[PDB]
């Protein structure tokens, strides 16, 4: 047990209501178990403990019945795991109960369960849902309906206490402290006295933020994108809009959908005609994308190489037709192909990043993230044609492209500290909504630990009684 770990238990150890705010992979649920062990080794009179391990999603509900079962079974005390898959009787049994909460929610609203008396220890995993009509809330609004008429010690376990639509600080605190007033909590406990030990055991890696140039023309696109329209226009014929998108090839497995359901001859030809439809916007959907962030040699290619196979196929009517549309434009495209003037400025930083990167240590381990399946092929072909990277091969080898030792996020429009967990990490973006969005995070960071500093350093009826008033606003407003 580190002792960050121990420092983290302290307040609950003593009694108090405390909730923990620690990174994810701390190992927090370590130091619950902690908790727990301390629980029933310092329990007085005739009265026996119990202990409720909340957790949100099944999955990971799931790896904490079996790691609450792994640890205490074998130290004499019974360990049932409640799941959707007789709450009276398993509650009376066990000495821990691992559960989701819509269930133990149900059981009190179904009138099965009456008192949570029952319980000593109630914890609850990712306790910053206690908000609006989260079940942990409604389990919590029982608890405070219990406490001012006529309780278990709460424990609450969150790598983030967050900070709602605060403005500033003073605006925070007071989303922290409504928080806290939620679940009843007497204390905040941090890392204070153990920040190198916790920051050593996870290695957070820097998040290179680097804002690319997309190039300035893309008729590419244009052309392209009038192609979809054409086919869009066609296919809406057949049965009764922003291109080179996530949304889009969403939209089109949507669809495709759709058309495999609907005189069943009739039905088929539909069906054909729309599939063929769907696959062919797809294709340029695909295009699109890999012109956006690749060379437009790439786009070209991955389409004639798809038409290639049409003309291959069976070749149907509608399938010629398009085909023919498609060679229409296609000198027109041929010609932007060649330009070695319009090439994608975006790849040139990629290159220009991986060039660097293999200088200051060519011994390097790179893992390139694209942003679909097309683009790694794309982007296999050209680090195979560069002058640059002549001297490295990749692999689908010290270099790997993927798709969703040093981890390149190659326009990745989500949250990054999640995509790290699936230490060296660069987010390559020309999109600047990206890019702001890491500097909002980081500030709003920023924001909570300074704000839980300062609600940290108060006295503890002064936080008790924030804490106290802000209840009895809420119940005043539950009559």
Same mark, same amino acid.
């Given at each position: 047990?580190?002792?960050?770990?121990?420092?983290?238990?302290?307040?609950?150890?003593?009694?108090?209501? $405390?909730?923990?705010?620690?990174?994810? @992979?701390?190992?927090?649920?370590?130091?619950?178990?902690?908790?727990?062990?301390?629980?029933?080794?310092?329990?007085? $009179?005739?009265?026996?403990?119990?202990?409720?391990?909340?957790?949100?999603?099944?999955?990971?509900?799931?790896?904490?019945?079996?790691?609450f079962k792994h640890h205490f079974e074998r130290q004499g005390?019974?360990?049932? @795991?409640?799941?959707?898959?007789?709450?009276?009787?398993?509650?009376?049994?066990?000495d821990i109960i691992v559960v989701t909460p819509q269930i133990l929610v149900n059981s009190f609203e179904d009138g099965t369960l009456t008192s949570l008396s029952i319980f000593t220890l109630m914890i609850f995993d990712e306790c910053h849902n206690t908000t609006g009509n989260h079940p942990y809330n409604v389990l919590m609004t029982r608890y405070l309906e219990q406490k001012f008429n006529s309780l278990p010690q709460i424990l609450g376990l969150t790598a983030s206490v967050g900070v709602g639509n605060?403005?500033?600080?003073?605006?925070?605190?007071?989303?922290?402290?409504?928080?806290?007033?939620?679940?009843?909590?007497?204390?905040?406990?941090?890392?204070?006295?153990?920040?190198?030990?916790?920051?050593?055991?996870?290695?957070?890696?820097?998040?290179?933020?680097?804002?690319?140039?997309?190039?300035?023309?893309?008729?590419?696109?244009?052309?392209?994108?009038?192609?979809?329209?054409?086919?869009?226009?066609?296919?809406?014929?057949?049965?009764?809009?922003?291109?080179?998108?996530?949304?889009?090839?969403?939209?089109?497995?949507?669809?495709?959908?759709?058309?495999?359901?609907?005189?069943?001859?009739?039905?088929?030809?539909?069906?054909?005609?729309?599939?063929?439809?769907?696959?062919?916007?797809?294709?340029?959907?695909?295009?699109?994308?890999?012109?956006?962030?690749?060379?437009?040699?790439?786009?070209?290619?991955?389409?004639?190489?798809?038409?290639?196979?049409?003309?291959? @196929?069976?070749?149907?009517?509608?399938?010629?037709?398009?085909?023919?549309?498609?060679?229409?434009?296609?000198?027109?495209?041929?010609?932007?192909?060649?330009?070695?003037?319009?090439?994608?400025?975006?790849?040139?930083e990629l290159v220009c990043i991986l060039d660097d990167a293999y200088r200051y240590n060519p011994q390097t381990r790179t893992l390139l993230f694209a942003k679909t399946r097309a683009l790694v092929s794309a982007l296999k072909k050209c680090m195979e044609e560069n002058p640059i990277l002549n001297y490295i091969k990749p692999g689908v080898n010290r270099l790997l492209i993927a798709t969703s030792n040093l981890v390149v996020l190659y326009e990745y429009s989500g949250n990054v500290t999640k995509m790290i967990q699936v230490s060296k990490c660069i987010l390559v973006t020309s999109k600047t909504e990206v890019v702001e969005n890491e500097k909002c995070n980081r500030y709003k960071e920023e924001m909570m630990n300074k704000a839980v500093e300062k609600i940290q350093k108060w006295d503890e009826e002064t936080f008790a009684k924030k804490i106290h008033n802000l209840q009895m606003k809420e119940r005043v407003l539950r009559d």
């Open positions: 047990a580190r002792s960050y770990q121990i420092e983290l238990a302290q307040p609950a150890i003593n009694g108090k209501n $405390a909730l923990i705010c620690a990174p994810t @992979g701390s190992g927090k649920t370590f130091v619950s178990i902690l908790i727990c062990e301390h629980h029933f080794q310092n329990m007085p $009179a005739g009265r026996k403990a119990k202990v409720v391990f909340l957790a949100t999603k099944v999955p990971v509900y799931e790896q904490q019945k079996n790691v005390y019974s360990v049932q @795991g409640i799941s959707g898959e007789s709450v009276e009787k398993v509650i009376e049994d066990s605060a403005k500033n600080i003073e605006e925070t605190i007071e989303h922290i402290c409504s928080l806290c007033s939620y679940l009843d909590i007497q204390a905040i406990s941090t890392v204070r006295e153990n920040i190198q030990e916790l920051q050593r055991f996870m290695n957070k890696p820097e998040i290179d933020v680097r804002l690319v140039k997309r190039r300035i023309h893309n008729p590419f696109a244009a052309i392209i994108s009038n192609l979809m329209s054409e086919t869009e226009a066609l296919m809406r014929t057949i049965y009764s809009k922003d291109f080179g998108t996530q949304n889009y090839e969403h939209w089109i497995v949507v669809t495709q959908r759709k058309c495999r359901l609907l005189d069943k001859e009739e039905e088929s030809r539909i069906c054909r005609a729309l599939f063929i439809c769907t696959e062919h916007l797809r294709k340029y959907n695909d295009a699109l994308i890999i012109s956006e962030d690749a060379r437009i040699i790439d786009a070209l290619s991955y389409l004639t190489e798809f038409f290639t196979n049409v003309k291959n @196929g069976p070749y149907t009517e509608l399938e010629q037709h398009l085909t023919a549309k498609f060679q229409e434009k296609e000198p027109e495209l041929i010609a932007l192909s060649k330009d070695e003037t319009n090439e994608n400025p975006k790849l040139e």
